[PDB]
Every structure is written in structure tokens, then in C-alpha cells.
Amino acid sequence: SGFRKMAFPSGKVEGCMVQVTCGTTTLNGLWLDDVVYCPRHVICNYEDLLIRKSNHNFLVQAGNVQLRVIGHSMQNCVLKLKVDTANPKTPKYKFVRIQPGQTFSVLACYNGSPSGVYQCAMRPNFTIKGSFLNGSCGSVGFNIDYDCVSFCYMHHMELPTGVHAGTDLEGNFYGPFVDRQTAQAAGTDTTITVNVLAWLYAAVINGDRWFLNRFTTTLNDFNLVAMKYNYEPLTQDHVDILGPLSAQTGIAVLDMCASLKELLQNGMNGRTILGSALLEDEFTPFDVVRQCSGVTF
Amino acid sequence: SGFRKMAFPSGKVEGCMVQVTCGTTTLNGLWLDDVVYCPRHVICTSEDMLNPNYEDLLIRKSNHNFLVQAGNVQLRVIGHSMQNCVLKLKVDTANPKTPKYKFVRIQPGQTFSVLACYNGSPSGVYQCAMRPNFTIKGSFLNGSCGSVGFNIDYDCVSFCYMHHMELPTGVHAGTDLEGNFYGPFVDRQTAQAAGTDTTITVNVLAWLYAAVINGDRWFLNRFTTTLNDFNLVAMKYNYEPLTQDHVDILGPLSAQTGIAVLDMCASLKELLQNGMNGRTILGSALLEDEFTPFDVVRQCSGVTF
Ligand SMILES: CNC(=O)CN1C[C@@H](C(=O)Nc2cncc3cc(F)ccc23)c2cc(Cl)ccc2C1=O
Ligand SMILES: [Cl-]
Predict the structure, then answer these.
(1) Do residues B88 and B103 lie in contact, with contact meaning Cβ atoms separated by under 8 Å?
(2) I want to staple B147 with a disulfide (CB 3.0 to 4.6 A). Which of A71, A243, B163, B194 is the partner?
(3) What residues pair up with B88 in beta bridges, in sequence order?
(4) Is the CB of B189 within 6 Å of ligand 1?
């Protein structure tokens, strides 16, 4: 028993973290095979600035060893530094683009040195509520499936509200953001409804049933209520995805939606669910099934 | 900016996780140098668990009865000894992935990262605290025994906890890496219960200082308090007594934010009386006690917003 915000073991990613310095800027890079991937703003019209640069301008440090840059190219907002040495610690990996509501682990780094690991979710407004300081740029987001690391996020910047913005490993930003100091703001955020429901199922599995009721709701009536509390619309796909948890607990998804409706209109009344006084939306249905089963990496 | 519950990178610990099997029991072991450390209850049956005589069970064992697996490689056990509630299996290979390490015993209120494992395979990492009642509110299932708690300050791993059991309330009990339990617990399936738990006051105060550093001051008031009057109010909400040691420890955060410890204590007193009134502090509707003063100084900026 117990329900914690759990991150993937970071070891396979730690073996890829490097420090990249270009002039006065120092940030983190991801060394996979003979390529170091890092935010293109380390050079700060990016192609016009990049064309002036030579290979020896980029200093890459892997632990106490200096890597030799033998080539460089730009892909969207990511810089790809070709190095002379293949990373012997390169794990089996894929570059994947995640959707909002999906969760991932973040290995926060400073000077190519991992300092912490935390779990978080891609918000519906495409920002992440991370924990980053100056020097964190180039820190990466990932998930693990058996022995394969799926890289999904590279940190680029902080917004005025304290939230974070970044790209997939192919350099495409998540959200309507650009990589420069300009007037940018996160859009109004919403709650990830399918994740709150999964977390209510996790509470039932851990013996927390005070919020259950005899009632049910139609999907349309639930969405009419949820739209009023800035909750993301619940689709039939979300309902199908919650199927296994529904069969395990004996509580139909629309039956759990009727509990969520009552929680939204009436609150917790001095009570908590899994030690929380707020409705938690940073655990996906798969995260709940994985943590309430025992899957290893 | 931002304030997350952050765990240490688990890589140096993952390279030490092994699977230990003795008869029908399978749990996790920690392989450091040529020794594998694991809960001594791996030698037990579920029957034995009521009143196990470990010395009697261990003397009946030979080296080849203990199967140790590191990945897909079988380690050979060449010796065994018991130290308190930990079994130490001497093996014929030193772990090449052994990091710089120490065995440290922590005090309640201290935090640490947990690498949860099943069958010598790490599955997840989370941050938690040693509760005042010596239990940990972990996330463990059957097969997690032998999972370890650690801190990685600088490049040295300080092992502080080894998981041994789950109490009836769902909380967890374990030992330091020398086999001494935290709390009045025994590795017996006897009727044991966690004592009434309390809130780690010095940690809640540190987290209020972290909120001030991140630009939030809604909860501050114009009042101060004596340490004794704060403790008289705090005990009424099941908060741990705040000692002069805690006040001294909060010194650097007080100097950084310009808010005296007993002034922050007055804000805490007020928060306990009023509640949050629909407001949050660092994204939380409850008062957080699983961040130490040291964690706050480590994670938060040196420049207050
Ligand atoms: C809740 N456990 C039980 O009813 C059976 N039980 C087995 C074992 C034990 O607690 N293991 C487990 C550890 N952590 C999480 C566990 C989650 C589980 F769902 C099951 C087992 C877990 C044990 C070890 C010792 Cl040293 C003393 C007593 C016991 C004991 O009582
Ligand atoms: Cl300590």
C-alpha cells in the first residue's frame, strides 16, 4: 500500500548527461551515440548566428573528459553536435512526442551533472510545473518501457508565472512558445479529468471509499458540469482507457464521474484522498495500474 | 522557480540492486564491494514469521542455499553472517559499479529517496521522510523488501534505510544498513502498530520559508511568539515540539528572507487556526512537512523573489 508521485529510475539517462558551453552560455546536453543534443539558444536568426560558429567554439564536457566536436547542425529548436566519440553508456532509446495529460520523469541537471529526479505532467496549456533554476536548460523528460528510454522533453525556458516550456527531442516546442526573451504567457490551464478519475480509482484500491455514491451520470451531463470547473472534456477514449480500473474496483467510469461531480460541487469537507486536500491530476491511468501492480526496469 | 518533491538521481543505487532467493522467499539485496546486504527474514517461512529464532534458522543454512542474481548473472555466495536484522552474504565478486558510499542512521524528520525494487529490478524512485513515529509512508507491494533509502549529497551515496515490513495501517517499517530498526518494531508478524503520528514542525517552517523565497507572502502576519507559547499551540494540532536546535537550523533561511523564526512561527500558528481559505502555498492545500531546511536551501534559489 501507499501512493507516491513516482519517477522512473534515472540511471540510463544519467549516463547521457553532458555540459555544453558556447562562449559565455553553459547548459546541459544529451549525448546519444556520437551526437550531443542541446537547446539551440546555447549560441545566443539562429541559422545566421550558427553559420559563423566553428566546431571548436562548442566545448562539450562528459564528466572530467572533454569531447571533440567534429560537426554541427540545427533541427528546429535543437542543436545537434556531432562528436568524435560514441557514448558507451547509450541505452536503447526512441524520440517520442507526448500529448498533454501524459506524464514523464525529469532529470534536472546543472553543468552536465544530474541533481534530482521528479515526476510531472504535460499540462493541457503545454507548460510543465517543474522545479528549475538558471543552468537547468537542456534537462530532459523521459519514460521507460522495459529497457527502452523514450525521450519526450528538453527544457528550454521559464515563463513569468514560474512554469516551464520546452521541446520534444526533434526541437518542436510543446505549446505556442518561441525560444527567445519576449512577451510570452501560459494560456489558462485546465485539470486533466481522465487523470483525476484514475487517481480516484487508485484511492479506492488503497481503501479510501468515502467519496463513492450510489449515483451515475451521462457523459454529456458530466462534461457540462466539468466545463464549468475548468476541467478538460472527458471523451469516450478516456472512458475506454479507464476500463481495466473500472473492472478491478467494480465502479463504472460514469459512476466514478458522479463522485467527481459531487466533489466538484461540494468539496472535500475537511477530508483528504490519498493524503491530499486537492484533486490530483498528475497520475495517468497507466501510472495507477503500474504503481498498483509492480512493473520493473 | 517552482517547488517539487525531488528525489536524488537513482543510477548509483540501481547498479547495486540484486535479487536474493532463499527457498521459496525472494527479495532485494544491496551489493556493495563483495557483500550483499538484505533483510534477515529472507531465511523465514510465513509460519516462522510469528516467533522466528533467526540464529537457529541461520545455523541450518549453507552458502549454496542462498541464490543471488545480479541481472542475468548468478553470484556465488562464499560466506554469511547476521548483523542485527540484516543478513550479510559474502560473494566471490566485487561489484564493479560500487559507488563511493557510507552507512548513516537518520533521525525522524530527515528525508531520503527510495528506489523501490521487485526481484532485484528497480521499478520507481520517490522522495519521503522518516516520520516522528519512525514509520515511512511509502509505496510498497509484496516483493519490495530489501528496497533502499538513500541521499546523494556530493558524489557519495549515504544508505540510510532498508525496507523490512508493512504495518496494518499501510505504513512501512525498516532498518538502517547495520540492521537496527527505526522505531519499536521487530521483524516478527506479531501484533505491532505505529504510534500516533505528528507533523514535522521544523520541516513545515522550512517549507514556509521556501514559499517566501518563491514570492508568496499571503500567510505572513505582524505578530511574533515565544517558543513556549508556539509549542503550547502546536501540540494542540499534533505538531512536533519545536526545539532551540530547530530554531538555530532555520537561521540561514531567516537571514535570507528577513523573517525571524519566531515571526514565521506566529504565521504557522495563524495558519493552524484559520486554514488556507481556498488558497494554496507552493501548489498545496495542506501544510507540507517532507522538505527539510537543508532540502529547501538545496532546491530553492539563493535570491528571494
Ligand atoms: C502487510 N503484510 C502482511 O500482512 C504480511 N507480512 C509479510 C512481510 C511484509 O510486511 N511485506 C511487505 C512489505 N512491504 C509492503 C507489503 C505490501 C503488501 F501488500 C504485502 C506485503 C508487504 C512481513 C515482514 C516482516 Cl519483517 C514482518 C511482518 C510481515 C508481514 O506481516
Ligand atoms: Cl538525520
Answers:
(1) no
(2) B163
(3) B37, B81
(4) yes
The x, y and z cell numbers of residue A243, run together, are 476500463
Query: Are B263 and B224 within 8 A, CB to CB?
Result: yes
The CATH class of the B15-99 domain is: mainly beta
The domain A190-293 belongs to what CATH superfamily?
main proteinase (3clpro) structure, domain 3 (1.10.1840.10)
* Nearest CA residue ID for atom 24, ligand 1: B165
Give the contacts of A127 (CB within 8 A, at least 6 positions apart).
A159, A163, A164, A165, A175, A186, A189
B132: CA distance to ligand 1 center in Å?
A: 21
CATH superfamily of A15-91: Trypsin-like serine proteases (2.40.10.10)
Could you identify the residue written with the cell 556493495? B32
**Chain centre to alpha carbon of residue B14:** 17
Q: Give the experimental resolution in Å.
A: 1.8
Q: Please, which experimental method was used?
A: X-ray
Which residue carries 516462522 as its cell? B48
CATH topology of domain A1-14+92-189: Thrombin, subunit H (2.40.10)
Say whether A8 and B125 touch across the interface (CB within 8 A): yes
Q: How far is A108 from chain B (nearest CA, A)?
A: 9
3-class SS of residue A82: strand
Q: What are the residue ranges of CATH 1.10.1840.10 in chain B?
A: 198-301
What count of other Cβ atoms lies within 10 Å of the Cβ of residue A296?
Answer: 18
Amino acid letter, residue A196: V
DSSP characters over B23-73? TTEEEEEEEETTEEEEEGGGG--TTGGGS--HHHHHHT--GGGEEEEETTE
